[PDB]
Amino acid sequence: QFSHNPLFCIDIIKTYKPDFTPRVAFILGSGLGALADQIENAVAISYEKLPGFPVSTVHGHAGELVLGHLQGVPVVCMKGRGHFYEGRGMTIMTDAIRTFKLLGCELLFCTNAAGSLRPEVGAGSLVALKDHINTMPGTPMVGLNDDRFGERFFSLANAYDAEYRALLQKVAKEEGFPLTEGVFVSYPGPNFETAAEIRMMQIIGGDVVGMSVVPEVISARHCDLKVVAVSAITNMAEGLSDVKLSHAQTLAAAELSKQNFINLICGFLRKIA
Amino acid sequence: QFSHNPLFCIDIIKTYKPDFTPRVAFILGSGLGALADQIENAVAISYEKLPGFPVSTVHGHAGELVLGHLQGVPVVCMKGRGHFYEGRGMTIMTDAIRTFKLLGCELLFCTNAAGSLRPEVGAGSLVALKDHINTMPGTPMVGLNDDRFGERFFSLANAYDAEYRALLQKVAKEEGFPLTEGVFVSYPGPNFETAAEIRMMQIIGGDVVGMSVVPEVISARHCDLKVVAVSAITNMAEGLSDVKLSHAQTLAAAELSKQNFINLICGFLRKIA
Amino acid sequence: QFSHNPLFCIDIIKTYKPDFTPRVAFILGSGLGALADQIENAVAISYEKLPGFPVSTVHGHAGELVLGHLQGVPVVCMKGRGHFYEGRGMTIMTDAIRTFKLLGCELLFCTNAAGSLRPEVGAGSLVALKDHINTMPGTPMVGLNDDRFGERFFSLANAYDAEYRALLQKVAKEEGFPLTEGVFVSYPGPNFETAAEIRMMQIIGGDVVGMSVVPEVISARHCDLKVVAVSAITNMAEGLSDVKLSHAQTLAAAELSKQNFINLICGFLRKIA
Amino acid sequence: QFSHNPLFCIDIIKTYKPDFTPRVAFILGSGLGALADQIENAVAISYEKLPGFPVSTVHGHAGELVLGHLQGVPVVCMKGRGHFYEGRGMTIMTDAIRTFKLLGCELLFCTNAAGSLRPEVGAGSLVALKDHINTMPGTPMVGLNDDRFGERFFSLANAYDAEYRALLQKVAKEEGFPLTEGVFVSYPGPNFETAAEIRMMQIIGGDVVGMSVVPEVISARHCDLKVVAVSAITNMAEGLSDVKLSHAQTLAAAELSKQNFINLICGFLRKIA
Amino acid sequence: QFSHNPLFCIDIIKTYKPDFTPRVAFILGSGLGALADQIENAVAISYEKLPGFPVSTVHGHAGELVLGHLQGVPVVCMKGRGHFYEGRGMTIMTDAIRTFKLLGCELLFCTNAAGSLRPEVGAGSLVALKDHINTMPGTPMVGLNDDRFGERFFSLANAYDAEYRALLQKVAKEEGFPLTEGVFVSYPGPNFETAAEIRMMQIIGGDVVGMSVVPEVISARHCDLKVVAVSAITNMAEGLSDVKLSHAQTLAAAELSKQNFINLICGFLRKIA
Amino acid sequence: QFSHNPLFCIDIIKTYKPDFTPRVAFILGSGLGALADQIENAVAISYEKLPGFPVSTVHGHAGELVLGHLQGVPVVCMKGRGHFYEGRGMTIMTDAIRTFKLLGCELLFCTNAAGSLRPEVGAGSLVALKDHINTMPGTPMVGLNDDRFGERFFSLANAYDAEYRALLQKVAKEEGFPLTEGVFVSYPGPNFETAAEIRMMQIIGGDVVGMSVVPEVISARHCDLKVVAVSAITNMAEGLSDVKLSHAQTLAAAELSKQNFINLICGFLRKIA
Ligand SMILES: Nc1nc2[nH]cnc2c(=O)[nH]1
Ligand SMILES: Nc1nc2[nH]cnc2c(=O)[nH]1
Ligand SMILES: Nc1nc2[nH]cnc2c(=O)[nH]1
Ligand SMILES: Nc1nc2[nH]cnc2c(=O)[nH]1
Ligand SMILES: Nc1nc2[nH]cnc2c(=O)[nH]1
Ligand SMILES: Nc1nc2[nH]cnc2c(=O)[nH]1
C-alpha cells in the first residue's frame, strides 16, 4: 500500500491555481523566502492543506507553497522544507517532489543553507552542487517501490544536471560573482558536525556540508525529475573558523548571499524561458 | 520474544527433502540461477512456504530454495535473496541463514552481482571477497540477542574464511582465469551510488561495491557459520566508466562471468568433497 | 508529547538520597564498577526503579545508580549504561543524562572500554577523548525537540571540555602514567568491527573505537552539561594484532588499566573540589 | 493530532463540482445504487480520490460519491459505505460525514439493507428508524475530541429527527405503502446473527437489525448534522423464518422494496424543496 | 513486560508527603472537587508528576491528587479520573488504583456523576452502588496478568462491599436524606445514551447509568482493594424526562446533591476512624 | 496481507504424522486433557512448533496438539485453547481452526468448562450447546476477509449442527446420564461475571456462560467446518449459589463430569465411524 498524497495534491492545487502547468519547482531553504515575494500572480497554499507536505517545525521555514510566474515562467515554490532530523525518516520530502513531477515540472531547483569545507570558499559564497555523498542513514526509496513513479533501481549519474549547471556558470559570469561547483555531503543533524567529522568530510572528498538536499534529490531522480541545486554558504564548517555556529547565525549570514542568489535564479529562469 | 521461523523451516524442509544434511548453503544473486539447474535430485521449495525467507520482490531473484547434490555434495541453494533496500531492515536475511545453520551446513557460499572500484578489474571479472566495510545503517544483530544461535558480541576476524579462500585461488588457477581478492563495501540503495560516493569508497579502502552480502555474512558469523563470498563484476562503479548503470545492465553483464563462476563453484565443491 | 522520565527520577531520587546535589555524574563502563564501592554513604538504586534508565542486558553492566561522596565530592554514578546495539535507538541514554542535568550536576564523566586504532597505544592504556566521529545511524536528538532541555540546533565545538582535559593531563603526570588524547569513533555493533572497517577508521582520523559514548555525549551537549570522557583500552582494534576479540577479553583486559583509571578519577575529583 | 481529510475533500470536490452547496447527503446501501442514476448533472467522484472515504471492499457497494440535483434539490450521494466489520474501527464513516457537514448539508439521509425483528414486518417492507441500540464495541467519538466539529459530550435525544420523520409518514401515505417506525440495533458482523442473539434483540426492544447506521449516525450528531434513516427489509432476522441468509439474498430482496424506496426518497425531497 | 508506574508513584509520593499511610482512596468525579479543599495539611500533586495517572482532558476533572487528613483520617484523593471514552482502553484507571493499593489503602471510595434509570430517583439524589453491569468493550485485566498485584482469574462477588454499604445506610439516616441502592451499568460514551439504549438498560436490570466506575472497580478487586461507590444523580437518563442532556447540565445539577454528598462522606469517615 | 500460518502447519504436521487425514478436531478445555491420553498411536506436537497456535498461558491448558486415532477414528486434538482475555483479540483461535479445515476434518468438537444459568442444571452436568449469544467485543472475522477460507458474510443458522446434536442425545440415553441442550453466552473475562450480569444473561435467554467457544465456533462456520460443542458445568454462575468461584474450583469440579464426558465423546465417535 502506497501514498496517494501527490495525486490528492494535484486536485487540491487545481482549486487554488487552475489551468496552470509549472515548469520549474523551487525549494527555498532558510532565509531565501524573500524570493517568493516576487512571484507573478502569487497564490499561496499552506502545507497544512496539502497532504504529505512538510508542515514546518523549523525557523526560516514557512510551510507555504507558492504558485505563479517568475520571469514569465510558470513556477511552483516551496517556502520551507522537511529534514531527516525531524524524525519522519528519509521519505519526508518524497511526496512533495512527486507532486512537482505530476504537476508537470521538468526540473527541481533545490536551494539550501550550508557550511563550506573549503577555506577558499567562505560565508557569502554560493556553490552549485555537482554531486553528493550521503551520510544520513539509508535512503528515501528504501521499502516497496512505487511503480507509478519510477523503477526499483535507478542511477544517480548526472543527478545534478550538467547542462543546467553550465547555464548556471554562464549567468554567474554575466553578473560578476563567483559560482564555484562542489560535492555536497549530507549529515543527519540536528546537532552541527564535530570538527573531526568535518575533517573526515574533507578527506572523503566533500566541498559543502548540510542537513538537507539528499532526500529531495534522490527522490527526484527516482521519478525522473531533473535536478539543480545551489547552496548559500553561511559559514565555514566546524573547526574551520573562530565563528560559533547556531541557527541564528545561519539565518543571519544567508543575507550576505541573498542578492547574488536572487539574480542567479532570475538569470537562470531568463535563459530557459 | 524471538523468531522460531528457522525451527519451523527445518520441519517444513524434512517434508520435501527427508534424511538430507546439506554441507554447503548457496545464495545465488542476480543472474546466477542457472547453476541451480544442475543440482542432483533437485527439489524446489518456494519461499512462500518457508517462514522468514525473502519472498522475492526483485528481478533476477526467484523466491525458490533448491535442495540436492552438486558434484556429489549435499547442497542447499537460495535462488534469490533479500536486500536492505526492500524496507524490512538489516535482519532480512537472518532467519534464512539460521535455517542453513540448523540444517547442519558448515559453510555459506554467498554470491552477488557488483560494481568494481578498481580500474584493473572490469566487467566480467570475479572477485573473492576477503573482508567488508559496512555503510548500511546499523547491523543485523541490533536488538535483543538470540542466545540459541550465538552470543551478544562476536568477532568478524577471518569472517571471509582464509582457508576456503586459498582453495578458491587454486581452483581459479586450475581453470584459466584471474581471481582477484577484494574488500567489499555495502551500500543501502536502491539508487546506485553517486560518483563522489564511489571516490569516497576508494579512499576508504574498498575494492567492490554492492547492496547485499553484509547482512547475510554478519548473520552467519553470529551463529558460527563459516563464510565464502564471490562477486560477479557487472560494471565499473559510477563515474569510473562511460557506461550507464541499470538493473537491466546488471542482469546482462552477469553472463560474461557466468561460465567462469559455474566452474569456480563446481571446482571448489570438488576440492571439499 | 515528551518524556517526563527525568522529572519522575528527580522525585524518586529525593526519597533514597534527600538534600543531595551532586556535582559530577559518572558512567562506569564494563569492568569499572569497582570504583563505585568506595563511595561515601553509598546509596544504590536499581535502574528498575528509575523510569528511562538503561535496565541492563549487558555483562559488565549492573543496572544500578549509586549516589554519594567520593574524595568528598557529591557524586552520582551509573554502574552500567545502555547501547545503540540494544535496539532502542540512539535515545537510549538520553533520559538518564537529562536526569543528571536536573539533579544539578555540572559535568558528566563518561568512561568506556575500547579498542585502539594506534599501534603506539596498546591494551592497558587510558585515552582521554578530545572529540568524536559518529558512525551510528542518526543521532539522539532526531525527532521533535524538547525545549525544556535545550534548543533545536546545537554546537559540538569543545564538546569534550578542553579545560577539564587539561586537568586530566596534570593528574596523569601527578601519578605516573601516559594519558594520550584521541578522537573516538562510534560503531553500532554488536558485532566487532572488520579489519577493513578499522583501516577505514584510521584513514578517517580516528584514534579509539567503541560502541558507546556518542549517544550520551551528544545528549549531554544538548542540555548544556559539560563532558569528560576517558576510554580504557582493552585491545587493539581488529586486524591490528594477533589477539582474538570477545566480550570476555574486554572484561579481562580492563583490569590492566583499572588502578590507573581509579587514581585518574580520584585525582581529577581532588582538583575540582 | 486530527484528521484534515474532510477539509481536503472540500477542496477536491470544488474541482469536480464548483459553486455547489448540497442540502441533503445520502448514503445508499446495498442494492440502492439505482437511485443515483437519476441525479441531475451527475458528477461521479471515486472514493479513491477522496481522502478518508470508504474505498469499497463490499459487493453492492460502489466506492463512488455522486453530486448533483434530484427533484431539483442540490444533493450529494454515497454509493457504498464503510462498515465496522471491515476492521478500521468505529470511525470508518466519520470523515465522510464531516465532509457532508462542511459541504453545507443540513441533513443526512442514511439508507441500509436490514433484517426485521417483528413478524408483522417482512421482506419488502421499509422501516423508518426512530432510534437505535448499539451493540458494536465502543463508539465513533472514542478518543481525543475534534473541537472543530463538535463537543466532547453530546446528546442522542431526537437523533432520528422527529420532524423529518413526520414528513416521511405523510409521503408514505401519499403513495400507497406502510411505513412502520422502528428501533434499529447494530451488530458487528460480518457473520449474521445467531437465532438466540436475535431473540435477545427482541427482548431488548429492537425492531430492525443491521451492520451499519450507528457509526454514521453518531458521527452526524456529533457535528450537529440532522439525521434521517430508512432500512429496506431484506429478510427476517435469523430464526424468524425458514429462509437461508446470505449477501446474495440481501442484494436480491432489496428489489422488492426498491420502487417504494425510490418514491419515498423523491417524495421527501419534494416536500423539503 | 509490565507497568512499574505504581512503584514509581510510591517513591514520588514519599517526596511530597513523607511518613504517610492513607487508609481511604477517593476518586472525585465531575463537580465534587470542593471536598478536597477541606483536607487537613493538604498536599497537591499534579497528575503530570505521577506516571500512569489520568492527566485530565475533561471539564470538571482537575488532574490533581490530594493527600492529607479528613475527619482525622489519613486520606488520598483523586481530583479527576480517566474514562474509557478517552481512547486509552479499559486500563486507564488501573495504574492509579494499584498505586492506592501499594500506598496501603484498605478501600477505594469511588464517586461519579450519573443518570437515573428509575423515575423514583431523580436529579439531586445519591445512590449507593451495590453492583454493576458492564457494557464497555472488554475489561481492564484483559492481557497478560500482573502477578505482583493479583491473580489471572478473580471474583466480583461482594465487589461493592456489603459491610461498608451498611455503614453508608446508617450515616444517611443520621443525616436526613434517602440513600437508595442500585445496579450501575457502564456505557462507553462519549455520546450520551439513546432513549432505546436506556429502555434496554431498565429491562436488563440497571438502576444507574454512567461512563466510569467499572474500570476502576474491576481493577480494585483484582488487587484486593475493597470498594465503595456512590453516584450523584444529575439527571434522568435519556428519554425519561423533558430535560436536554449536556456536560454543562451534568456539572450544574451535581450541586443539588453536593452538601448531602459531603456529609455522607464525612459521616462514613467518622464511623470508620 | 493474510496469515499463511495454517498452510505452514499443514506442512509441519506431515513431518510428525504422515499420510494422516483426521475427520474430527477436538478442543479440550480445562481439565479434559485426560482424554487425549487414550488416543491411538498418539503423536504430540507442542504449540510452540505450530505457527498461530495458542501457546498456552493458562492453567488447565497444555499447549499440545495430539494426533491419532480414537475409536478407530482419525482424530486431531487441542490440549489447551486460546481465549479473548489473553489480549490478542477475537482472532486468537482462528488460525488453529483453519488448520483443522485444511487438514481435512469435517467437524470441530469444542469442549469447555462453564457456569450454569439454570438452577435445574448444576455442577457436574454436561450441556450440549445449541446456539450462542456473543458478549465479547466484536467478532473473529472483523477485518479484511480471507477469500481462501470463506466469504465476507456468512450465516450462523444451524451453527451447532442439529444432526450431530441428535446423535449426542442418543449417546446420552444409551449411557444413563442427562444431556440438556442450551444457549451459550460468551463473556470477555478474565474476571468472573457479576451477579447482576448473570441475571442479565438469564433475562437475555442464556443457559450457559463462559469465556470461550464463540471465537472458535464463528471461525469454524466461516470456513465451512461443522461444529459440535459441549460444556462441562463446573458451577452455578455467580449469585446463583453460595459457592465461591475461582480457577481452582473450575479445575476441581470438571472431574465430577469427566467420566460422563469421556463416554459421551467416545460414544459419539462410535456412531460416526
Ligand atoms: N550541517 C550543517 N548545516 C548548515 N547549515 C548552515 N551552516 C551549516 C553547517 O555548517 N552545517
Ligand atoms: N551498489 C551496486 N550494486 C551493483 N550491482 C551491480 N553493479 C552494481 C554497482 O555498481 N553498485
Ligand atoms: N567497538 C569496539 N568496542 C570495544 N570494546 C572493547 N574493545 C572494543 C573494540 O575493539 N571495538
Ligand atoms: N446484521 C444483518 N444485516 C442484514 N442485512 C440484511 N439482512 C440482514 C440481517 O438479517 N442482519
Ligand atoms: N452515561 C451517562 N453519564 C452521565 N453523567 C451524568 N448524567 C449521565 C447520563 O445520563 N449518562
Ligand atoms: N465465565 C465463566 N467461565 C467459567 N468457567 C467455569 N465456570 C465459569 C463461570 O461461572 N463463568
Structure commentary:
The structure is a homohexamer of 273-residue chains. The first copy, chain A, is an alpha/beta fold and 273 residues long. Chain A has a single domain, classed as Nucleoside phosphorylase domain (Rossmann fold), CATH 3.40.50.1580. Chain A has a 5-stranded mixed β-barrel, surrounded by 4 helices. The radius of gyration of chain A is 17 Å and the shape is globular. At the A-B interface, β6 and α5 of A face α4 of B. The complex binds guanine (GUN) (6 copies). One guanine binds next to β5, β8 and β9 of chain C. The site of one guanine has 15 residues of chain B, from β5, β8 and β9. Chains A, B, C, D, E, F: This is Purine nucleoside phosphorylase 2.
Secondary-structure element string of chain A: HEEEEHEEHEHEHEHH
Largest interface: A-B, 28 and 31 residues
Residue share in β-strands of chain A:
15-25%
Tell me the number of helical segments of chain A per DSSP (H or I, 4 or more residues long): 7
Strand order of the largest sheet of chain A: 5-8-7-6-9
In CATH, the homologous superfamily of chain A goes by the name Nucleoside phosphorylase domain
Q: Work out the count of structural domains of chain A.
A: 1
- The rounded distance between the terminal residues' Cα atoms of chain A is 39 Å
Bound molecules: guanine
Biggest sheet details of chain A? 5 strands, mixed, barrel
Computed over alpha carbons, the radius of gyration of chain A is: 17 Å
CATH class of chain A: Alpha Beta
How many β strands of chain A by DSSP?
A: 9
Structural class of chain A: alpha/beta
Assembly state (oligomeric)? homohexamer
